[PDB]
Amino acid sequence: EKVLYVNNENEPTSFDPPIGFNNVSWQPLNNIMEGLTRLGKDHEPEPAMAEKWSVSKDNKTYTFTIRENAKWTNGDPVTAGDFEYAWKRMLDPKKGASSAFLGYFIEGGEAYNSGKGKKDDVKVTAKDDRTLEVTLEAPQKYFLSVVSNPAYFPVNEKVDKDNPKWFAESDTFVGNGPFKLTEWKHDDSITMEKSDTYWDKDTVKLDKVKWAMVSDRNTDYQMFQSGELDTAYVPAELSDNVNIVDQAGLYFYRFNVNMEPFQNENIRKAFAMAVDQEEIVKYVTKNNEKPAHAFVSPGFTQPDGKDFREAGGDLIKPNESKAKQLLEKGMKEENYNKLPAITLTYSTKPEHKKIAEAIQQKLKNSLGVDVKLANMEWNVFLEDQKALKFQFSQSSFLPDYADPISFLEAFQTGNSMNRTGWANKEYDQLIKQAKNEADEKTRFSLMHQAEELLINEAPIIPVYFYNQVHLQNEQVKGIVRHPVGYIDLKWADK
Ligand SMILES: C[C@H](N)C(=O)N[C@H](CCC(=O)N[C@@H](CCC[C@@H](N)C(=O)O)C(=O)O)C(=O)O
Ligand SMILES: [Mg+2]
């Protein structure tokens, strides 16, 4: 028996596909479910549930043919109807999926989600059981990548109506991906087995994947040294076994611009300019992460061949003396003799505590500001963050497709990925313009203009750009970790 041993670190938020919208949920979900496409070894979308597609001359209407003999774990056929149902479901305002904006690529999607349009004016329709037609608002070169995103995964319509909570346990789960969910001990472990109903089961070489939920990267490393894990993190305080692989996105902090004292732009800028991202990566993380002096990470090539982040340059760098000046100026503007109490809230986990402590110490040392730390587990932390309950909070962004607009759309007014209360009409206009811009050089210019404005008003503090550095059992081969998107294990062997 070949059993791959990995660590998920924590409990998935949700296995209802559009709901989790995070690594902890979607790393495992990506291996028990499947979209129309799946990203391959070269990170390009390849036929998965769709065996092929046709695109109209105007580049807006995609017609997908569903694989013959694609089946759910319960033996039901995977139909075009399951995709139509799932996509209209994810857009349903009553559902409140944070990922619903990803459905706005579909004509009528934004209108439906916003209550200004009808469900059946969302332009996704099953023409027959094996034919799915979708019309986009505008051409989208990354659409075939987007439909590998878990938000776009099908749901078995029959199963969903019979039991609307099917996704909540292994016993009731019905999936269509390379592995079958066979055990889910909440907060302890996940087990999945090679799925004997899967269309491409002959490709799948592993018998089982077991997912631990060990949140201490030190205990992780110990489990790797003892042989209990096939893959593991590299501990900061340590330094052929090691695999360095890119991952777009960043670690950052959010302010709430409607909670004192962060209504004042100078106070926000002061805090942002106090943080020294190089010190964080050099003295805390220590996994060769790039310090983040902007929001959009490395990895996005421009029309001119340059990297977007390289071309844009640093937008925010530590400047202690200027920070002190701006804090003084902002406090005077608000008639503050002393700053109101500030709490920095992070999600309960050793790395987040160690970074929050560094930020706490730096703010004290640079500005003389005392912040108190608070923490809660990710699942409720995320709910509270979305609800705008935190003054100042640990934040993470992974792009959903491989373009800077994935990052920049986050900070539109009221966006599910904003969570700061920041509401800049000029920013909103730049994003709208970029979303409607067919000329790529122009579109890139608009995106740099937007990013400069975002960083200038400092509703956020960028900290560091991600990567995926791991130890791996040399007897495991063929794990595919993508720069944008979730781990693929279907090709792996041991
Ligand atoms: C997926 C969606 N676009 C998005 O960004 N969701 C974020 C959550 C994004 C998210 O799961 N981060 C991960 C990133 C892990 C990066 C990895 N190298 C590491 O260092 O372990 C996390 O913090 O564990 C949201 O809802 O707040
Ligand atoms: Mg609404």
DSSP 266-329: HHHHHHHHH--HHHHIIIII-S-PEE-SSSSPS--B-TTSSBHHHHH--S----HHHHHHHHHH
Q: What letter represents residue 448's amino acid?
A: H
Taking CA atoms only, the protein residue closest to ligand 1 atom 27 is 396
Whether residue 139 contacts residue 59, with contact meaning beta carbons closer than 8 Å, is answered with yes
Q: Measured between alpha carbons, how far is 99 from 382 in angstroms, rounded to an integer?
A: 13
Q: Measured between alpha carbons, how far is 417 from 94 in angstroms, rounded to an integer?
A: 18
% helix, strand, coil for the chain, step of 5: 35, 20, 40
Tokens 């799932």 -> residue = 86
Residues constituting the chain: 494
Q: How far is the CA of 381 from the centre of ligand 1 (A)?
A: 13
User: Ligand 1 within 6 A of 297 CB?
Assistant: no
Please give the structure tokens belonging to residue 217: 């990267």
Taking CA atoms only, the protein residue closest to ligand 1 atom 16 is 466
Site to substitute for ligand 1 among 22, 280, 406, most atoms within 8 A of C-beta: 22
Beta bridge partners of residue 293, listed in sequence order: none
C-alpha separations of 99 from 5, 57, 151, 175, 467 in Å: 29, 29, 6, 20, 23
Q: Which atom of ligand 1 is nearest to the CA of 233?
A: 21
Q: Measured between alpha carbons, how far is 212 from 312 in angstroms, rounded to an integer?
A: 40
Taking CA atoms only, the protein residue closest to ligand 1 atom 23 is 396
Taking CA atoms only, the protein residue closest to ligand 1 atom 24 is 23
Q: What letter represents residue 285's amino acid?
A: T
Taking CA atoms only, the protein residue closest to ligand 1 atom 21 is 468
User: Ligand 1 within 6 A of 464 CB?
Assistant: no
Q: How far is the CA of 139 from the centre of ligand 1 (A)?
A: 28
Nearest to 395 by CA among 300, 463, 478: 463
Nearest to 473 by CA among 235, 240, 288: 240
Please give the structure tokens belonging to residue 456: 């200038």
Please give the structure tokens belonging to residue 419: 């969570």
User: Ligand 1 within 6 A of 287 CB?
Assistant: no
Sheet of 189-194, strands arranged across: 3-7, 208-212, 189-194, 179-185
Q: How far is the CA of 481 from the centre of ligand 1 (A)?
A: 14
Q: Measured between alpha carbons, how far is 274 from 321 in angstroms, rounded to an integer?
A: 9
Q: How far is the CA of 15 from the centre of ligand 2 (A)?
A: 24
Instruction: Give the long-range contacts of residues 353-360, CB within 8 A, separation 24 or more.
Output: 354/236, 354/284, 355/251, 355/280, 355/284, 355/285, 355/394, 355/463, 356/394, 358/279, 358/280, 358/283, 358/284, 359/253, 359/275, 359/280
Whether residue 147 contacts residue 35, with contact meaning beta carbons closer than 8 Å, is answered with yes
User: Ligand 1 within 6 A of 468 CB?
Assistant: yes
Q: Measured between alpha carbons, how far is 355 from 333 in angstroms, rounded to an integer?
A: 30
Q: What letter represents residue 20's amino acid?
A: G
Please give the structure tokens belonging to residue 322: 């200027």
DSSP H or E run through 125: strand 124-128
Whether residue 95 contacts residue 151, with contact meaning beta carbons closer than 8 Å, is answered with no
User: Ligand 1 within 6 A of 7 CB?
Assistant: no
**CA pseudo-torsion sign 481, 484, 487, 490:** negative
DSSP H or E run through 376: strand 371-376
> How deeply is 164 buried, as exposed, middle or buried, from its count of CB atoms within 10 A (0-12, 13-18, 19+)?
exposed
User: Ligand 1 within 6 A of 125 CB?
Assistant: no
Q: What angle do CA 344, 347, 352 make, to 5 degrees?
A: 80
Q: Which atom of ligand 1 is nearest to the CA of 382?
A: 27
Q: How far is the CA of 334 from the centre of ligand 1 (A)?
A: 35
Nearest to 366 by CA among 272, 465, 254: 272
Taking CA atoms only, the protein residue closest to ligand 1 atom 15 is 23
> How deeply is 378 buried, as exposed, middle or buried, from its count of CB atoms within 10 A (0-12, 13-18, 19+)?
buried
Residues with CB under 5 A from ligand 2 (ion): 115
CB burial of 15-51 (b: ≥16 within 10 Å; e: otherwise) equals bbbbbbbbbbbbbbbbbbbbbbbbbbeebebebbbbe
CB atoms near residue 219 (< 10 Å):
16
Tokens 């631990």 -> residue = 212
Backbone angles phi, psi at 20, to 5 degrees: -55, -60
Nearest to 292 by CA among 271, 327, 268, 316: 316
Q: Measured between alpha carbons, how far is 6 from 487 in angstroms, rounded to an integer?
A: 11
The residues near 26 (Cβ < 8 Å, ≥ 6 apart) are: 20, 150, 486
C-alpha separations of 84 from 17, 36, 80, 305, 334 in Å: 14, 12, 6, 38, 52
Nearest to 125 by CA among 141, 145, 106: 106
CB atoms near residue 120 (< 10 Å):
12
Nearest to 289 by CA among 333, 242, 245: 245
Q: What is the phi-psi region of residue 421: left when phi exceeds 0, alpha when psi lies from -120 to 50, beta otherwise? A: left
- DSSP, collapsed to helix, strand or coil, labels residue 265 as helix
Please give the structure tokens belonging to residue 418: 């904003």
Give the single-character DSSP code of 67: P
Q: How far is the CA of 385 from the centre of ligand 2 (A)?
A: 19
> How deeply is 224 buried, as exposed, middle or buried, from its count of CB atoms within 10 A (0-12, 13-18, 19+)?
buried
Taking CA atoms only, the protein residue closest to ligand 1 atom 12 is 396
Nearest to 344 by CA among 328, 368, 332, 360: 360
CB atoms near residue 361 (< 10 Å):
11
Beta bridge partners of residue 135, listed in sequence order: 61
**What is the C-alpha radius of gyration for the chain, rounded to an integer number of angstroms?**
23
Q: Which atom of ligand 1 is nearest to the CA of 419?
A: 27
User: Ligand 1 within 6 A of 416 CB?
Assistant: no
User: Ligand 1 within 6 A of 347 CB?
Assistant: no
CB atoms near residue 264 (< 10 Å):
20
Beta bridge partners of residue 62, listed in sequence order: 55, 134
Nearest to 487 by CA among 1, 13, 25: 25
Resolution, expressed in angstroms to one decimal = 1.5
User: Ligand 1 within 6 A of 398 CB?
Assistant: yes
User: Ligand 1 within 6 A of 397 CB?
Assistant: yes
The residues near 240 (Cβ < 8 Å, ≥ 6 apart) are: 474
Q: Measured between alpha carbons, how far is 74 from 107 in angstroms, rounded to an integer?
A: 32
User: Ligand 1 within 6 A of 466 CB?
Assistant: yes
Give the single-character DSSP code of 167: G
CB burial of 83-105 (b: ≥16 within 10 Å; e: otherwise) equals bbbbbbbbbbeeeebbbbbbbbb
Q: What angle do CA 220, 222, 225 make, to 5 degrees?
A: 115
User: Ligand 1 within 6 A of 23 CB?
Assistant: yes
Please give the structure tokens belonging to residue 72: 């759910």
Q: Measured between alpha carbons, how far is 398 from 331 in angstroms, rounded to an integer?
A: 34
Please give the structure tokens belonging to residue 24: 């902890």
C-alpha separations of 15 from 168, 170, 183, 279, 383 in Å: 7, 10, 13, 37, 16
User: Ligand 1 within 6 A of 396 CB?
Assistant: yes
Q: Measured between alpha carbons, how far is 196 from 172 in angstroms, rounded to an integer?
A: 17
Q: Measured between alpha carbons, how far is 9 from 407 in angstroms, rounded to an integer?
A: 25
Q: Which atom of ligand 1 is nearest to the CA of 466?
A: 18
Whether residue 394 contacts residue 347, with contact meaning beta carbons closer than 8 Å, is answered with yes
Q: Measured between alpha carbons, how far is 24 from 140 in angstroms, rounded to an integer?
A: 28
- DSSP, collapsed to helix, strand or coil, labels residue 96 as coil
User: Ligand 1 within 6 A of 450 CB?
Assistant: no
CB atoms near residue 337 (< 10 Å):
6
Whether residue 450 contacts residue 459, with contact meaning beta carbons closer than 8 Å, is answered with no
CB atoms near residue 58 (< 10 Å):
10
Number of the ligand closest to the Cα of 113:
2
The residues near 202 (Cβ < 8 Å, ≥ 6 apart) are: none
Beta bridge partners of residue 55, listed in sequence order: 62
Please give the structure tokens belonging to residue 239: 């330094």
Backbone angles phi, psi at 372, to 5 degrees: -100, 140
Please give the structure tokens belonging to residue 145: 């990548």
Whether residue 262 contacts residue 268, with contact meaning beta carbons closer than 8 Å, is answered with yes
User: Ligand 1 within 6 A of 247 CB?
Assistant: yes
Whether residue 267 contacts residue 326, with contact meaning beta carbons closer than 8 Å, is answered with yes
CB atoms near residue 171 (< 10 Å):
10
